[PDB]
Design a protein around this motif. Sequence first.
Motif, PDB file in Angstrom:
ATOM      1  N   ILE D  85      12.688  22.863  -5.702  1.00 38.65           N
ATOM      2  CA  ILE D  85      11.342  23.364  -5.937  1.00 38.65           C
ATOM      3  C   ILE D  85      10.920  22.984  -7.345  1.00 38.65           C
ATOM      4  O   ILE D  85      11.744  22.695  -8.213  1.00 38.65           O
ATOM      5  CB  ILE D  85      11.223  24.892  -5.766  1.00 38.65           C
ATOM      6  CG1 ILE D  85      12.225  25.607  -6.653  1.00 38.65           C
ATOM      7  CG2 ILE D  85      11.450  25.291  -4.335  1.00 38.65           C
ATOM      8  CD1 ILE D  85      12.069  27.088  -6.623  1.00 38.65           C
ATOM      9  N   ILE D  86       9.611  22.992  -7.558  1.00 38.41           N
ATOM     10  CA  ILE D  86       9.016  22.921  -8.886  1.00 38.41           C
ATOM     11  C   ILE D  86       8.478  24.299  -9.217  1.00 38.41           C
ATOM     12  O   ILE D  86       7.703  24.864  -8.438  1.00 38.41           O
ATOM     13  CB  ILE D  86       7.894  21.874  -8.950  1.00 38.41           C
ATOM     14  CG1 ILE D  86       8.392  20.514  -8.481  1.00 38.41           C
ATOM     15  CG2 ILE D  86       7.360  21.770 -10.349  1.00 38.41           C
ATOM     16  CD1 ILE D  86       9.359  19.880  -9.426  1.00 38.41           C
ATOM     17  N   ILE D 108       9.312  23.055 -14.200  1.00 36.28           N
ATOM     18  CA  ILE D 108      10.765  22.954 -14.211  1.00 36.28           C
ATOM     19  C   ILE D 108      11.241  22.725 -12.784  1.00 36.28           C
ATOM     20  O   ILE D 108      10.962  23.541 -11.905  1.00 36.28           O
ATOM     21  CB  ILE D 108      11.429  24.207 -14.806  1.00 36.28           C
ATOM     22  CG1 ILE D 108      10.785  24.568 -16.138  1.00 36.28           C
ATOM     23  CG2 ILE D 108      12.905  23.984 -15.008  1.00 36.28           C
ATOM     24  CD1 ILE D 108      11.365  25.783 -16.762  1.00 36.28           C
ATOM     25  N   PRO D 109      11.918  21.622 -12.486  1.00 33.67           N
ATOM     26  CA  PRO D 109      12.572  21.500 -11.181  1.00 33.67           C
ATOM     27  C   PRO D 109      13.823  22.364 -11.124  1.00 33.67           C
ATOM     28  O   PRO D 109      14.586  22.448 -12.087  1.00 33.67           O
ATOM     29  CB  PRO D 109      12.918  20.010 -11.099  1.00 33.67           C
ATOM     30  CG  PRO D 109      11.981  19.369 -12.050  1.00 33.67           C
ATOM     31  CD  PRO D 109      11.897  20.333 -13.185  1.00 33.67           C
ATOM     32  N   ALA D 110      14.021  23.021  -9.986  1.00 37.69           N
ATOM     33  CA  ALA D 110      15.192  23.862  -9.788  1.00 37.69           C
ATOM     34  C   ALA D 110      15.675  23.741  -8.354  1.00 37.69           C
ATOM     35  O   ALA D 110      14.872  23.714  -7.421  1.00 37.69           O
ATOM     36  CB  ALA D 110      14.897  25.323 -10.119  1.00 37.69           C
ATOM     37  N   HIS D 111      16.990  23.674  -8.183  1.00 36.34           N
ATOM     38  CA  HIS D 111      17.574  23.581  -6.854  1.00 36.34           C
ATOM     39  C   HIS D 111      17.557  24.944  -6.182  1.00 36.34           C
ATOM     40  O   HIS D 111      17.856  25.963  -6.806  1.00 36.34           O
ATOM     41  CB  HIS D 111      18.999  23.034  -6.942  1.00 36.34           C
ATOM     42  CG  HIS D 111      19.712  22.964  -5.631  1.00 36.34           C
ATOM     43  ND1 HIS D 111      19.591  21.893  -4.776  1.00 36.34           N
ATOM     44  CD2 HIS D 111      20.592  23.811  -5.050  1.00 36.34           C
ATOM     45  CE1 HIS D 111      20.341  22.095  -3.708  1.00 36.34           C
ATOM     46  NE2 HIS D 111      20.960  23.252  -3.852  1.00 36.34           N
ATOM     47  N   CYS D 129      22.193  24.891 -14.981  1.00 38.42           N
ATOM     48  CA  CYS D 129      23.479  24.324 -14.604  1.00 38.42           C
ATOM     49  C   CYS D 129      23.610  22.921 -15.172  1.00 38.42           C
ATOM     50  O   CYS D 129      22.802  22.504 -16.005  1.00 38.42           O
ATOM     51  CB  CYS D 129      23.648  24.294 -13.088  1.00 38.42           C
ATOM     52  SG  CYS D 129      22.153  24.014 -12.170  1.00 38.42           S
ATOM     53  N   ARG D 130      24.634  22.196 -14.752  1.00 38.97           N
ATOM     54  CA  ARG D 130      24.756  20.799 -15.108  1.00 38.97           C
ATOM     55  C   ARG D 130      23.699  19.980 -14.377  1.00 38.97           C
ATOM     56  O   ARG D 130      23.189  20.400 -13.339  1.00 38.97           O
ATOM     57  CB  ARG D 130      26.154  20.303 -14.770  1.00 38.97           C
ATOM     58  CG  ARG D 130      26.273  19.804 -13.366  1.00 38.97           C
ATOM     59  CD  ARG D 130      27.677  19.948 -12.871  1.00 38.97           C
ATOM     60  NE  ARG D 130      27.857  19.255 -11.612  1.00 38.97           N
ATOM     61  CZ  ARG D 130      28.516  19.769 -10.585  1.00 38.97           C
ATOM     62  NH1 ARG D 130      29.062  20.972 -10.690  1.00 38.97           N
ATOM     63  NH2 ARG D 130      28.631  19.083  -9.460  1.00 38.97           N
ATOM     64  N   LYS D 134      17.989  13.608 -11.307  1.00 33.69           N
ATOM     65  CA  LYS D 134      17.350  13.041 -12.485  1.00 33.69           C
ATOM     66  C   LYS D 134      16.649  14.115 -13.306  1.00 33.69           C
ATOM     67  O   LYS D 134      16.716  14.104 -14.539  1.00 33.69           O
ATOM     68  CB  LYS D 134      16.376  11.946 -12.076  1.00 33.69           C
ATOM     69  CG  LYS D 134      15.990  11.036 -13.202  1.00 33.69           C
ATOM     70  CD  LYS D 134      14.784  10.224 -12.841  1.00 33.69           C
ATOM     71  CE  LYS D 134      14.361   9.337 -13.979  1.00 33.69           C
ATOM     72  NZ  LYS D 134      12.912   9.474 -14.219  1.00 33.69           N
ATOM     73  N   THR D 135      15.990  15.066 -12.650  1.00 31.76           N
ATOM     74  CA  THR D 135      15.173  16.035 -13.354  1.00 31.76           C
ATOM     75  C   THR D 135      15.644  17.475 -13.229  1.00 31.76           C
ATOM     76  O   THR D 135      15.149  18.326 -13.972  1.00 31.76           O
ATOM     77  CB  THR D 135      13.721  15.961 -12.864  1.00 31.76           C
ATOM     78  OG1 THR D 135      13.657  16.393 -11.503  1.00 31.76           O
ATOM     79  CG2 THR D 135      13.206  14.539 -12.930  1.00 31.76           C
ATOM     80  N   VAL D 136      16.582  17.779 -12.343  1.00 32.48           N
ATOM     81  CA  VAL D 136      16.948  19.155 -12.042  1.00 32.48           C
ATOM     82  C   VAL D 136      18.118  19.559 -12.919  1.00 32.48           C
ATOM     83  O   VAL D 136      19.146  18.875 -12.949  1.00 32.48           O
ATOM     84  CB  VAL D 136      17.303  19.331 -10.560  1.00 32.48           C
ATOM     85  CG1 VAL D 136      17.813  20.735 -10.319  1.00 32.48           C
ATOM     86  CG2 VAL D 136      16.116  19.025  -9.688  1.00 32.48           C
ATOM     87  N   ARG D 137      17.963  20.672 -13.640  1.00 31.75           N
ATOM     88  CA  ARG D 137      19.067  21.244 -14.397  1.00 31.75           C
ATOM     89  C   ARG D 137      19.129  22.758 -14.234  1.00 31.75           C
ATOM     90  O   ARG D 137      19.776  23.431 -15.040  1.00 31.75           O
ATOM     91  CB  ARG D 137      18.963  20.909 -15.889  1.00 31.75           C
ATOM     92  CG  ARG D 137      19.246  19.472 -16.248  1.00 31.75           C
ATOM     93  CD  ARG D 137      17.977  18.672 -16.184  1.00 31.75           C
ATOM     94  NE  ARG D 137      18.076  17.393 -16.865  1.00 31.75           N
ATOM     95  CZ  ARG D 137      18.501  16.283 -16.282  1.00 31.75           C
ATOM     96  NH1 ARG D 137      18.871  16.305 -15.015  1.00 31.75           N
ATOM     97  NH2 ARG D 137      18.555  15.152 -16.961  1.00 31.75           N
TER      98      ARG D 137
END
Lengths: 261, 178, 138, 145
Positions: D85-86, D108-111, D129-130, D134-137
């Motif tokens: 998600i963004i 912020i991208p997030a899983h 997280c790690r 490319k953009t998700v942390r």
Amino acid sequence: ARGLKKHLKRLNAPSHWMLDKLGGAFAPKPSSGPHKARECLPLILILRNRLKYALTYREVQSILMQRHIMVDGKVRTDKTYPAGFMDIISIPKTGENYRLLYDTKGRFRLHSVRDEDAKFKLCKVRSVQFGQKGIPYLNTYDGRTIRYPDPLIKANDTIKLDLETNKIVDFIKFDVGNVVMVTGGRNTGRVGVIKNREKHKGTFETIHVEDAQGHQFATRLGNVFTIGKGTKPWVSLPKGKGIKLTIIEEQRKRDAAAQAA
Amino acid sequence: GISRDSMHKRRATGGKQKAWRKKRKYELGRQPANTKLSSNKTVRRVRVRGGNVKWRALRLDTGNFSWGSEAVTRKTRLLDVVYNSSNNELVRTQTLVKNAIVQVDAAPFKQWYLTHSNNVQRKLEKRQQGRTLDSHIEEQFSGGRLLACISSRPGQCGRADGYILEGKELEFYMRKLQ
Amino acid sequence: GKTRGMGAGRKLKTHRRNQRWADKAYKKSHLGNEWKKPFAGSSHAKGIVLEKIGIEAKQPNSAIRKCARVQLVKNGKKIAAFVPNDGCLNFIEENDEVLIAGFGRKGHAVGDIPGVRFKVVKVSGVSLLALFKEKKEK
Amino acid sequence: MAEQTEKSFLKQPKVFLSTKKADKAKRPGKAGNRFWKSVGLGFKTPREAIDGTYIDKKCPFTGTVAIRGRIIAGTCHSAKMNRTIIVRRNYLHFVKKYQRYEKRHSNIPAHISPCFRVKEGDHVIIGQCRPLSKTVRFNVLKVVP
RNA sequence: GAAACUGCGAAUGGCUCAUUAAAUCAGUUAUAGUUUGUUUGAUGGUACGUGCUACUCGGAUAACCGUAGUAAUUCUAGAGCU
RNA sequence: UAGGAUAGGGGCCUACCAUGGUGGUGACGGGUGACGGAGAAUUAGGGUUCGAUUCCGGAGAGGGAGCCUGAGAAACGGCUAC
RNA sequence: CCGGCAUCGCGCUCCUAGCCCGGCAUCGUUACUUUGAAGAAAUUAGAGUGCUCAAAGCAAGCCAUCGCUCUGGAUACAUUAGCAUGGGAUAACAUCAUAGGA
Ligand SMILES: [Mg+2]
Ligand SMILES: [Mg+2]
Ligand SMILES: [Mg+2]
Ligand SMILES: [Mg+2]
Ligand SMILES: [Mg+2]
Ligand SMILES: [Mg+2]
Ligand SMILES: [Mg+2]
Ligand SMILES: [Mg+2]
Ligand SMILES: [Mg+2]
Ligand SMILES: [Mg+2]
């Protein structure tokens, strides 16, 4: 940079070394060792600067190559060796022994101790855990690793370590009610007593401390170093018994001491 | 050479990214090993960061394979690669990578299962109380080989190791090989 | 009236940003056309004298203002420079190196001399001041 | 099952499914049981993650990713990706000359683990997280609709 | 002790500011996402013997000596030693 | 998603799949006679302008590109090519 | 200036826990404000000190200015962001009429 840096420019040296800014372009650049080089005091400063036993760079080397200076029980001939908090510096040729301790202003001082209180140090444990073949070992904050510790010693505690036998002889359990001397931040040097510890899940733990003369302050866990069990400390204190004071208090101290002279 | 920096990539906005640096050696990659499955074994050492070594295996023939429910691991041969979930052309090229599906000679496993006087039989009889050996493994045995999955990185450690498929995994790959 | 909201910081800051362009000094220094000028953002410039011309003064005055047309070495532009003193034009000769400065007023014409904003200050490596005051000769 | 929809059989690392002597009370991820973990920092493992059938390598509670660093809170802004998600963070930036504020935002991208369900414009709490792509942390830990 | 092999260092320092506008950078984080000569502290069995307390010693190269090439260079070939 | 590569995370790269991602809260593009910061000048207060330069961080060694040695270099008082 | 209570103060097993007793933790978030921590030096401000003064510098001063004494080398500012602490006026955003309330 394509690798490790080997020079320390004088303006970049630690502020508590009190190196003067026009005394050259470089500073001693402590070598790697048992202390983090921003909280250490190299041998060049102990001999040349503080004790005035030598006047130049090369005189310190002439002292060390002759195996006089002894750090924590072994003779260290390295000239930028990073001596640190609670180490012992001994010159048997002069029969003189110093414990490195802080003063209230946050600067290392060589507090003279006796020969009885020079065969031991105290050391705070970084952690305890297992090693190869299930053997437990503990880490200190100055590099020492001891195997087969007392199964009670947990992380952040304090241990007494005899320099002769090199094993533990006693320990202090880090907890509320013990005297502690602060080793970081603005409160470094101030001794006190742990009055409170507040946990925060995922951040640094903070400690609330109260001085013997009533002044209350706080720090974070990593900067606190227990000295003794109960209110009595196990080691000697320097010219001020770890009691911070305001600038007005020392102004009064100078002018009051200016009437007897 | 081949590089692992983000500089050539476009920003998340899609805006192009200017070059403010040359390529650094701590950013490198190398070309792959595409370990072939062939008799003439060759594993060639690589000097990598820190002075350490990785073993690039160019050609492997045997492997170490574990049979999980029976808790035994044996050396055996690799007969072929039959399915690769990434690219089929890897299968056509008989290239070994992690998570590839291979057939295995299985005879060392068969001879272990041949095992398991008086005290010897009073132990064969202790076992065989829990013998199940689901028919899916039995049929493969009579065929002579076992389907197995590689669980190691041949181009990284220079080895082909793995396990034999069982249960849900075994039946899934069976229906996919149909 | 003026926007006064607490959450109006963008509106005020963007408004000042737009309106500063209405100010001639800001626009003069922030638009870039000073690098297109003869001197190209310099205090002084060296040149070669091309000819001596002489220019009239505007209406309330009456005189001949004696100027030398110079070519700038750095960029090849052609300008006219006043030669300030009585008789200093006779120091100027043809095809000699000359150091030119501004007239004051920062690129705007000074006094009664029409369309001249440069002045001659050195000739042949020697000051016009020292030649007019006899301290040095060329 | 429902999870096995991709060209390779998907399974949790380090759980042996075809175990011999199985059980229902050993520990999460022992004797064939599905593995789950508690993230820490006062978050509670969703029940749908506990008794779930999805396989997600990147899930905070059943995958291999650890949550450490910052804990941001925002509102969901886009849910049109697969398991990502963004989120929008809205905040006030101070403009010092004018002594005032302005509204700023960051995407912020997030899983998003399958154990949650998100509409557009739900309150989300994400933890770092790690780098997962490319953009998700960041990883979603709580969703309040 | 010169020379020479071996080792180490030469990835620091010095200079500049061309490229570079969420880039660098600053404060602030993280590595449960890694490498780290060196310093410091601790640590280290089985090599085959059918695990029944250890099982034998290589050639070859510089400094040297000597025959040269090329206009030429810390350009270079061949031979005798150790 | 699975791999390959890396010291390691990661479209970093490959195969397959989905159609996303940023944007008037200024994306993308353009200018910069733009390395960033600590700081500098002037300062009632608020501000305006500057910061190539000795400290910190980055980058380069005529322009690009590729490498060997090594713990550490994409090194230039190292090599290879244009 | 403030603590500690009492009026008609939604609770606690678990941490601190007085000799049945204050002052307990999750079942709305922020801005704002207070205090603290952690914040490189050099620069700036500023304490000390008669380089002969000053710009400076980080020194030095006493001894019987005799086998050395006392030493100093403070302190502060550091917008915004991030961490923690008290306050809950002011203002945001979320929201008890389907009682799916306690
Ligand atoms: Mg350098
Ligand atoms: Mg050194
Ligand atoms: Mg004007
Ligand atoms: Mg991957
Ligand atoms: Mg430039
Ligand atoms: Mg320039
Ligand atoms: Mg620099
Ligand atoms: Mg370089
Ligand atoms: Mg040049
Ligand atoms: Mg190069």
